């Protein structure tokens, strides 16, 4: 499970489905920009 | 299941097991900031 802390999304992102994720947890989830993911609760 | 798109870490952000999720997905997933989420592939 690749499991990170939320941080408030930054005014230009909101409202448009995006989450901003680096290229640590990007690379154990196995995505690239422009991927999509799933969010869910620990 | 909540699903976003995935965007570049902001510079400050990088590193810090950190995500950024806007109020919209966060109220769908079930999480504040602060809270921990699974990222996970479509």
């Known amino acids: ?5 939320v941080a408030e999304a930054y ?3 909101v409202g448009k489905r995006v989450v901003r994720v680096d290229k ?9 920009v ?6 869910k609760k620990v």
């Not at 499970?1 to 802390?5: G, L, S």
Request: no cysteine; aromatic share 8%.
């Open 34 to 39: 422009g991927d999509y993911v799933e969010v």
């Open 11 to 13: 005014a230009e992102d």
């Open 1 to 5: 499970k690749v499991v990170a802390r």
């Open 24 to 32: 640590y947890e990007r690379a154990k989830v196995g995505v690239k």
